[model samples]
Each structure stands twice: as structure tokens, then as C-alpha cells.
Target: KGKLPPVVSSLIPFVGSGLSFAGGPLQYTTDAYKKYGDIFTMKVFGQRLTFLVGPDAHVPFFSQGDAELSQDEPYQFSVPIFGPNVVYGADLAHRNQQLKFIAASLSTKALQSYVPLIVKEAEDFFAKWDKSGTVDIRDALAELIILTASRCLMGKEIRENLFTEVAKLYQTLDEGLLPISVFFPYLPIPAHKRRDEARLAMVRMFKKIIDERRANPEVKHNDCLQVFMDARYRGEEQALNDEEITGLMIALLFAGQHTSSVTGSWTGLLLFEANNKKKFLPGVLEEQEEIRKEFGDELTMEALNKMDKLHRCVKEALRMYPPLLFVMRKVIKPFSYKDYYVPEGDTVFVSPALSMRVEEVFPNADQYNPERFVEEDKQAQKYRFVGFGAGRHGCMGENFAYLQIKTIWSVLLRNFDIELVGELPKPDYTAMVVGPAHPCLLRYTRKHH
Candidate 1:
């Protein structure tokens, strides 16, 4: 704002992307509350990143369009995991226009019919360990979500072992930050070699999926992949090129699996136990159960649509673990949010990790309460609970994500009771997405009801 504040120097110690730092965006930079008061600046990767901590500072940032603030930044760290030509690359946007083809396939009509298909694939995954003792729910959730997501996104005919290849793709994406020397990624180096390995492995897997999808098309799929296939179902128009299709799949898989996995795992640990501890969890479960009973054996889209409490539970999970660890914006023109004008070309980071905790937005904000998002909590505006981010570049996956979250929790609660093997661990931010700080072991005993 005025002169350079003390907070600037405080974050100086943690400069640049490096091997030494354990926390990604999850950790606080220089105890922001105490030093900078709320909005502060830090030098991360050679740029002065102003961390906007409160809603007062955040409103203006979200209000702007992609022209003013870039949702897509070339130097953003996720490019490697997302691949050079896939997520953050030059061709990514041109390729993403084809994703409109995908969104059409995964629409409400397309995806709604796929829930039972998700359950079908889920049974295949569960057969291996539906009752397996003390399984890592993290692994189980990933497996189930991946199976279902793959089936729904790609189509039901994709192989059962597809999860194995997807796991490799996940590994490459989750490798965290790259070596600092490779900052200018154009040059060739050992780090670049490793990056290439990850990228190639992911592309190869997606290429295989692309080939299969080319053969048969889903007329009824709202799966994102089906949306892609529908682009050329009659072979009248060509679908995305191999690289483009691969990149798009990589983006969706990373999006669907990573967030969904962490979210599913956290809900298992928190929801079941959180239910017994507070009146909150039971209310959510009861609401979902009532929906299932009302629908009886025919739990249709109309039935699941009414599970509003479940919506709140997932919202809380997202607040706790936003799939995207950070939301970044760089100023393209001189703009003033308040008393001070942030010069053009400076990056401002507004975190849901920070925003959802605003005291005014959420009373007892730090507390894990789902009821806050229920009917009485409908007033909770976009700015307050911005798990999906707000404004022009908000995740297009929000509509599908809501239903998917409900299905995972609803089905899991209906089929098994999740029991924590030990104390729940803090989420580890070291990975790509925010997930358990330690591997959590759990028992999923079948519920005979």
C-alpha cells in the first residue's frame, strides 16, 4: 500500500520454489495475521505476491474478468504436472474450446443416468476390498472415485485396470514442484527430462483412452469424455487431435479425481465421527437417508436432488480442502481496491483457504459445522464460501461436482460405516491436492440395514 511493509521482509526467508519448503500454499507465510494485518506481500518465484487474507481485500480481485486477472498463467507451477501442451501450455486454451464438446456429454441429462453406472464400477472396485480390514480410506476413496469417474467420464466399457494407468498419471501430476534450475522450462536438463517422463506417461495413457473412445460412442453419456466423442459421433466432424484430447482428459481426470478423492476421504473421516460428536452429522445423514427411503428402491435424480444437507457437508469439506490449493490473479492494469492502487502486473493471491474462514461470512468460522450451509444458511453468498472460486474463470465442474460428492457420501454411508483406525491426521499439503497429512487407516464394515 504505502511503503514496503515489514511483512515483505518476513517472507523473504521463504523465497522462491525450492526443495527446502515442505508446505505449498497450505502453510501461512510469515504469520500473516500478526505482521501485515491481513493483506500482505511476499516474494515467491521472483514476483511480489500480495496475499489478500480477508473479504474486504478479496472482493475486487474476484470481480474482475480474465482480461484483468489471468486464471491461466504461463509460469504457474502446475504446468509440469498438467503437461507442457495440456493445462498451462500455449495450445491449452485453443484445445479447451473442444472441452465444450465434453461438457455437453457430461450434462445433467448425461451424468444423471450414470450414477448406477458409477455404482456398478464401484462394486468392481469394492469386490477386492469392500470388507478389507483397516484399509486406507484414502486409497479406497481414490479407487472408488477413479473407477466411477473413469466409467462415467470415459464410458462404462473402459477396462477395470484403467485405474492402474490413471494412478501413474496421478503420480506424475502429484510430483509437486519441479527443480528450481528448470525455472525457464524451455531448455533441456535432467529436471526437464523428468518432467518429460511425467508428461509422456500421462499423454500415453490418455492416448489409449482416446483410441478406445474413437471406436464406440455413448449416446446417453453426460460423461465429459462422451461430450468429447459426441463432437464427432457421426464422424462428420473430427474430435480433438491426439495431444489436445489427451490434454483435456488429463485436465478432467486431475480435476475429478484429486479433489473428489481428498473430499471423499475427509468426509468419511469427519462426517461419520463428526456426526456422533455433534448433532450436525446425524442431521445430514438423516436427510440423505430420508431421500433414499422416499425414493425407496428407485432413488432417482429427483430424489438425490433434494439432499440439501449433503450439499452443505461437501461445501464444508471443500472449505477445509479446496481442490485448488490457491487462486491467483495478476494485475494487467493499474487498479485500486481501496486507499492504495496495486500497480499493473503484480500478482494477488486470494485463497479460499483464507476467505472461507472470514468471521463476518461464517460465524464460528473455524469450527467444522455443516448446518451453516443448510436452508437457513442459503444466505451464504458466493464470496463467503468460494470453494469453487468466483468470477469469470470459476471451475466449470461445479454442477457435476455437487452430484458426485453427494453420490460418494450417500452410497458410502448406505453401504458401510467408516471407522477411524487412529486419530485423524492433519491434511498433507505436500501433495498436489490437500489431503491427509498422514496415511489414514480405516475399517468400512458393511451396514446390514
Candidate 2:
């Protein structure tokens, strides 16, 4: 019980390194890693966050079973947003059941059906364009992805009839992902109040949807909502109840939104900036042009698969600006790392941004070089790129996310010649999922037919 990783102490007690850690985690973590080597601890808000970097750290943390290490404790605040008996609130078996229902929607059969739907949404969204116009990339993509995700995942009724209200409600719920809320979610704060109110509104709204569907079983629908309506866990007599279904819907929407939007925004900004500096844009355009010639204006899953260069660019963007910068867990049992032992009830942290940027794994890690991910090179750096995380706990919606991002960008690239109107935006660390610090303005001119 005596052995431990090196601790990076700050003179300020209870608030040790909180300011620095939040202000610039990338640089703070990099410097700390250099000074303390692979494993170290940073005290923040009276909690010791132990960081385990590189594959030696990644393999164990990402691979450990729930009995040994659990993801719920570090993310308890989400319970308030997702409602009761869902995700982090539920045990391993229940969580897996919920995930299975979600996975059904993201399956290959379903994804194939989703492509043209996504394509149409992207087309309809961007159709109201003048010959040329400027837009904030992050803001624009956020709206687009929400529309697409809702339409495809939740169902058309929710996307078409209730999108605006749902989006506004989501904003209030999202406001609760603050530093303060993580430790003290129920504190008598304005944000927490707003979050609870938003959650209640969402729950009532979704419950109405579920109740109507149940009352009218003669009707038929083929969406995620329908999937959940029929999904029954093993040995359970009935499907998930109304409260559980509402919570699951919230969890699905919350999970599918930000990470995709943030990553898409970053990918757009990076590719646009790098296009100016290098021939990056040309390479991606060449691939897109060829795909256009083959597919002839209609986007397909095959087209998305052939987008190797664009995919590389997306991978590069994720490497540079990961949405969830830190993946955290709590040790349920004594966890050993190298010579150090992390006892139970300790917070374990891993940074994808930090690990992905290590010089040894990625040459010129600071630079935005999409070429670094050319097939063989990418496969060589195996365990290093953890944008969607690692092993079984990796993002369930990853394929769907890639499809959404690629579809949106594919449509945008095909119809317009987009250029940056201002300097590239930096990461906004204030969010749970890091987004653009400022609106990424791009001047997009419609390409002649």
C-alpha cells in the first residue's frame, strides 16, 4: 500500500494544479510526463488524478474488466442528465444490455439504410446557400450533425417536429458538464437547476413518445426508438420501462452528438488550415473528385470506404484535437502499474491527446500532416491513436460517427469550394468534449454544376 506513482505537487492545497490543468492540459500533461516519466499524479480540488500514459498504461486501463476498474464513478454527473437506471447509474450487465440495444441501430444493415438519409439531411441543410457565404464551422456542423443524428437515430418525428426544442433543452443539459458539477452535481447552483429542469422536460417529452408508441402497437417504425421499444434484457420479462427508455434515448443522443460535432469541426479547421500551408486540400479533393465520378452525385457507403485520404485527414485531426481529452476510471481493486500500486478508490486518468502526440509514436507530432496516416504508417502506430478510445470500451457509435462526418464533409466538398475566412480556431477546453475555442469561419463558394 506504500508504493505509488510520482506525485507532481503544487503549493496550493485542495486547489493544487487545478488552474493550470484546466487552462492548458496538453502542455501541463506533456511537461509533467517529461518530468515524472510514464506515471504521475496531479492533485486537483482535493482529488489526486493519477495519469498513466503510453501503451504500458493504456493496455491495462483500457483492457481491465469492470470488476477491477469501473467507468461509472468518474462520470457520475451524467446520471442526472441521462436520468435514473441508465448508463453509469446501472451495473455492468444492465449497461451492456442498453449498449446492445444501441448497437442494433448502428449495425451494418441499419447503417446502410442510414446513408441516403444522412446524405439527404446534409443536402437539405446546405441547400439554402447563396453563391458564396461565410459560416462558423463548429456552429454549423453542430446543427447539421444534431439534425442528422436525431433523424437517423431517434426517428423522423423527433428530428422534424421537435428538433428546435430538443436542441435548446440539450444546451441546458450540456451546461451541467462543468468542473463544479462533476464533484457536486446536486449543489444549489443555477446551472444545476437549469440542468434538472431541462432533464425533466426531456423526460416528459420522450415518455410521451414511448407511451404513444406502446398504446398503438399496430403501427410500424424502423428507427432506434423502435429498437429500444422492443429490446428486452436476458431473463427480464418485459422490455425497458418508460423511465429506462427515456434515459436510454437521452444517453444515445448525448453520446452521438458532441464527439462527432467536435471532431468534425476540428477536422474541417485543420484540413482547411493545412490546405493553405501544404497540398493537403488538393489530395483530399482528388480523392473526392474520383469518388464523385464513380458515384455520380449520390453518396454511398462504398464512397465513404474509398475515402482513404479524407479518412486519414480525419484521423490526423482526431490525433491533434481529441474531443474527450481525458478518459478516467476509478480502481475498484488494487491496480498495479510498473513499480507503483494504485489502491482502490483512486482516480485513474489517461490522455489520448498526450499519448497520440508523443514524438516517438508520431514523428513531428505537433504538425498537421495527414500523410503520417497513410495505411502502412498508420498501422505501425497501433495502440497510440486512441481517438475513439481502446479495446471493448471504444466508442460504440464510431462507425456511425465516421459515416456522419464523412457524409457531411463529402456533400460540402462536392457542392462548394470552401476557404477559411479567418485564422484557425483553437480548442475550447471549457466543454466536456473539447470544441473550437471560437467559431471557425469559412467562406464557401458554390461550385458550378
Candidate 3:
């Protein structure tokens, strides 16, 4: 607070202003990081000043014990984005309990068990694409992942039919995050109304799904939904209600799709651009064939593990272009960093994207190289490449995301050899997720299996 940077001073008064908030928070800060050094300050929304960005800042910022930084002040903004009592506002101590259950449920057993369901859905997806020559991969994959997550999280049979509606609900969640209503989350406006509509669509769709999962006495299956239903209706103390169940599912859907969809899009574009995609397409096909031979055409965990090349490819793609440009964390205390005395009640910004691009760590940091992630490479441990973040606060859906993305790229590479129809576009960080601009047209030629 002794001497303010020009950019920091300019943004402080305009924090509540909508577009300026977006431009101020995202654009100005990012440019400041690019131009200025790693450590700097920017004022936004009252007296909050966030550290500009770098790995060094994040290491200490996120390294606090789980109890200290258990996402209280850091993610308070998310309440407006997600909702009241949706994510961390609920029994905060028990969030880990829910996450542990999710981790257990989606482990090798559950993911392997759902491989056929994913393969079946993929077959359905490809069958439709075969006749059409091409489909909006974003739209197409959204449906597939929504269904896959729904089936995996709940069960395939009871909620399979609810996929489309649930997908629609999940699709609009991003719209809820537009800067329009963040300053006034409870205020009703057109955008907020639409967000409510989206939330209601998911809730309504899942209510029926939960009811069916509950009432389907004729059939039984292992799904996360059944788990939630059983826990909720047992009359046990501290049980969650149906709305909480729906919010939890919505959270899962967001976790499942938002980052992966963008990553999938970037993976497609990067693979297409690098080495014309045809030279490597054969190996991808060969991997698919090998996986099919071993896993019997289902993309099982064993099969997913066997497709190690695809995993490396996905690792490179995410490293090259992570789905998030930067992440925001608010400091919990007057933690001293260097000689600077940053007071409490200040936001701290960390850039995993910037960290991953550090040339010291990644040789030819700008070049598109997937082999750097091959198991033999020295920095294969989790902390070195932290697109998923590090420590307990790292993304909970980490494994689920890896398997989903691996399956997607494996199938995408297997089905068609692709060529970019136009110049590949860079990421758009205007939204919560990093995304490709429109006209991301890529021409695909069907690969004869």
C-alpha cells in the first residue's frame, strides 16, 4: 500500500462496473503479468489487492495446510457464480467427505465398469457423425460427456434418458457467470433469470432422474446417484436433501465438462496443426486398435492405461494450452511475502498457465512438443506440471478428467484424420474457461479402420 502501480490504482474505483470489472480483472491483470514482473498488485472490488502471478507466489499461496486455506475467503466469489450453499457454503468440513466418496466411486472399478457405456455412447455419436460427414464437436461431445457423467455419477440405466435435458442445464451454467450479476447476485435481471432457468432445468431434470433412481425397484446398478439417494433418505442425521443432491450433481457436471470441453477443443486443434496430423494419425489408430484388441473395444481403465501415448498427448495439450489462463485466490491472513506486507482481505492471483510456460522447466517452452511428458522425462511428478493445481486444494476431479479426456482424444484420433480448415485461433480468456474463437473449422477425413 506504500506505492501503488498505475494499473492497480485505476481499477480500484471501477471494480463494481461490469465490463470494466471483466476487462480490469482479467485483461489488465494478465497484461500486467506479461509486461510487469511476477510480483505486482492490482486493486479490485474494495481494497482487495491480488499478487500479479507466478509459480513462486502460488507455492506459498496454495501451500497452506488444508485447514488454513480450506477455500473460505479464496472462493467466496464463487458463491455468486455457483449459488448459495452449493459448493463450499454447505457443511464446509464435510466437503472432503463428499469428494472422497466421489473419488472412491469413480475409481478404476467404476470407470472400468462404465467403459462399455462410454463406448456405446461413442458408437451412437459416431453413427450420427458418419452420415453427417461432420458435426459440431463441441455440441456432440457435450451430449456424450453429459450422458457419460450422468451415467457414471448416478447410473447408466435410470438417468440415461435424462442426458439431453441435463446437458442443456449444464450448458447454461457458464452464462450464470457473466459479469452482469456478480456484483448483485441476488438481484433479478434477464441474465440472472436465464441462469435460474438453466439451474432449474438441471434441477428439474435431475429430480425426475433421482425419483426414477429411487423408485426403479425392477433394476439395480452402482451409480453415484443411488449412493446420494440412499444417504439422503436414510433419515440419518445431517443427511442432504434433494436440492443439495441436485446442486452436488451440477457441481460434478461443471467439474466434468467445463475444463475438459475446452481442453478437448484445443487438443483437436493442436494435433491437427502439429505435423499435419496424418503422420501421427496412424499411431493413434494403431493405439486404438491395440486398446480394442485388449479391452474388447471398450475404453476401460486398463485400456485407458494401455493407451499411454494418448495420455502423454493429452498431457502435452493441456500443458501447451491449459483450460484456465489463471486462477484467483484470496489471502486468508496477513501472510508476509518477501519484504512486502500484503494485508489480509486481499485477493491473490496465480497463473498455472504462466508457470507451465517457464522455459527453465520446459525446454523450447513455446514449441509444441508432446514427448516432453513421456514417462522418461524427469519432471513427471504432479507438482512440476500443475494444470490441475497442487496439494489438497488441487482439482478433485483430476483422475476423472484425465480418463475422460484420454478417451475423447483416443476416439477422436481413431475415427478421422483431421486438417485445420483455417488458421488455428488462440484462446479466449474472456469467460471463466479458456475457449477457442468461432470458425474453428477443421476438415476431417474418415479413417478406414
Candidate 4:
């Protein structure tokens, strides 16, 4: 028999660390790690959540297959959001196959074609802005991300005709992912009601498109929707049904939209930070100029690959403020980690937020330094820089996410002179996917050629 990880002491019974965690998740986790070391369990609302911090813990946390630690049970809250028989709603074998469709849709060949689409959307979106004004970057990027994601992933029918309605519905669905919803997703409440309504509306909308595509096979589309429409599991006779197709589309959008928007906002804000402005912004602009000289107004995957400076800035921003604070899986088979036994039926958490900020790993851990990634000797160890995640279940859309964010910033940096308005906004910890707190204002003036 193996020893269990130290359990965090609690003052109140049953409630147990829930209030403290709800208030500030990062701080509470940090304090717990300091007191209990790398691995410890905290009881919150009767659930045992064992947190595994640092690279050593992260190795097994990510590398282990679903047999040892299953994601389906821990992420059941996603069932209502992603619909049935898709993502967390499906069994491990089927879920892995479903994820293959998503990955293939965002493959290198597909991503090469998306650069122009993303660049065009970003260009057209910012065209309406005034010469000089104060704007909320978070809100602006949120809308822009939907436009680009829709055009590239959902197809022309959605982006051109039903964008406004679909975008609003997505926002409603997003609001349903509150901390409480994780435990009580089906609770009869206003937000849950709206979420259900929005999900049904989206299902209806996508079904109509599928019907059209089926009725007229002559029409061809190059978006992820088409890929899902045509996808088939091994040894299966028929392709994915209408409901399954609709659910996959929703899952694709949900996965990329908010994460890209949040990362894009943080990249811009961090680039214009007081200390980073002169030091890093100039280098980013220089790289843009070099790309412009080489490509001559065309945005390509190769061009994006060459954007080392801008890429590092976005990478740094992600490291500083990862969208998902904790990546979790339910322990299926009992496992041991350095003298600790994490029992079955409990939840295990690996915090990208904390791992990316370890003092010994990242020198000057609190600073916004893109240069940290440039040095040969200073690169972070494997599994440490997991903003997009790592190992077996790593993000399939990693390349697409980078391309989307890089394209947005490249356009903004080339055309506008931007600066943060007042102090930088702190991370808002209340949301399931953390982002810059409200009123992330920025001032900008169009650059004259």
C-alpha cells in the first residue's frame, strides 16, 4: 500500500476550502503548494481535488492514458454545452476518434489556407475604427475572434449571413460555464435556461446548413464544418449524423473562440506594457517590416513561421496569463507519484498557471520578458511551457491558435500605433476561462504611410 498525499486542513466542515478557492483560485493554490509541497489534496464541496504542480507531477499527469486518468467524468459539465455523443459526452474510444476529426481539420494543409482568411477578417474588422479613440481591447478582440473563427471554421454561410445571431448565442452559451455550473450544470436557473435555448437554436441553425449541403452536393466548402460533415469513424457505415455534426461544430467553435480572443487581448496588452513597450514592441515591429518586405502584402504560413519576435510575445503572454488555469482529469486507476498514492474516483489537477511561473524554472518569474524564450540556454524544460497543453491530449489546434493570434497582432502592429490606457487590467479569476478584467482599455491612432 502507498501513502496518500497530504490533505489541506480546513476550518469549516463540508464547505472545506471552497470559499477560499472561489475567492482567488491562483493564490489559494499557490499557498497550498507552499505549505503542502508539490502534491496535495483539497476538499471542496465534498470532492477530493488532488493538485499536481511542477514538471515532475505534470509528466504523469499528461502522459498517462485515459485508463489511468479519465477526462470524461471530470468534464461532464461540458455535456450540456457540447451536446451528446461528442467530446466529453462520448466514451474514450469514440471521443479520441472525434478529436481526430478536429485535428485533421486544423492540419498543416488546412492552416495554410486560413492565414489569408484570418488576415482579411482582421483587416476588415479594424477598418471601421476611428483614427484615434479609447476602446476596450477585450471586447473588441472577442467580436473579432468570432468573425475570424466563423469565417475560417464554421463556413461562409455562417460568417456572411447569420453571424450576428450566432455570435450572440455563443456568448450566451459561454456565460453558462460558471464555477457553480461545474458542480450543478443542470440546475434550473436563468443562465442555464438561456444556455439550453442557445444550444437548441445553434443546433437548428447548423441542421439547416447540413440539409442544404446534403440536398445540393455540387456546392463545395473548405471549412471545418465540411470536414465534420464528411467524417466517418473506422468500421462505421454512415457518416456522423446531423446532431453529431452540429455538436462537433459547436465544440470546435467553443474550443478556439474564447481562448484565441483572450490570448490575443493579452498579447496586445503585454506588448504595450510600460517596461515592455520600448524593449519588445520595436523588435515586433521590425519583424513585421521584414515579413512585409519578403511577402509583399501576402500573409502566408511561412511568413507566420518567420514571425519569431511576435510569436515569442504571444508565447510570453500565454505563459503569463494562460486561459485555462487548471487542466483536470478524474483518477480512474490508483496511481503513485513520488511516495504519494492518488486514489481512484478523485479529481487530479495540473495548473498551467502555476507551472509556467515556477521561480527556479523562469528567472525573473513575474516579469513580461519575451527575450526569455530567445536564449538557447534559458529555454524552459519540456512539459513546463504548456500553455497550449502537452503530451497525449495536447491541443490539436495549437498551430491554428498561434496563426490566428499572430495574424491579428501583425495587422494591428503594422497599421496602428497602440498603447494601453492607464494601468494594466488584472486577470479576472471569476470566469471559467480567465481573461483580462473588464475595461481593458487601449488608445490607438492610425499610422500614416
User: Which candidate number would show the highest TM-score if scored against the true structure?
Assistant: 4
2 or 4, greater by lDDT: 4
Worst 10 residues of 3 by lDDT: 11-20
Model 2: lowest-lDDT 10 consecutive positions: 12-21
- Between candidates 2 and 3, the one scoring higher on lDDT is 2
Better of 2 and 4 by TM-score: 4
Order by lDDT, highest first: 4, 2, 1, 3
TM-score of every candidate: 0.82, 0.91, 0.83, 0.92
- The reply for model 2, stretches above 4 Å from the true place, is 1-21, 44-46, 274-277, 375-382
Model 1 residue-pair collision total: 7
326-405 per-residue lDDT for model 1 (tens digits):
66766776677667777776777777776766676677776777777654356644466677777766777786677666
lDDT (10s digit) by residue, model 4, range 1-449:
89988898533222222322264468888998989889999875667888888888887788888778877655777789888888888887788899889888999988877778988898888888899998899899888888898898889899999899888888898888776676667878999999988888888898899889899998778898888988888886468877788788788888888788899899999899778897888888888888899888777788889999888999999999998887777788988888988898778888888888888777887999988887723645667687877878889888888998898888788778998888888988776678899889989999987
Q: lDDT (CA) for every model shown?
A: 0.64, 0.80, 0.63, 0.83
Residues 52-94, candidate 3: write the lDDT tens digits.
Answer: 3545556666676554443554344445444556666545555
Residue 417 CA displacement from its true place in model 2, Å:
1.1
Over 4 Å off, model 3 = 1-36, 52-54, 77-83, 131-134, 157-159, 197-207, 215-219, 232-236, 274-298, 336-341, 375-377, 380-382
Clashes of each: 7, 0, 2, 0
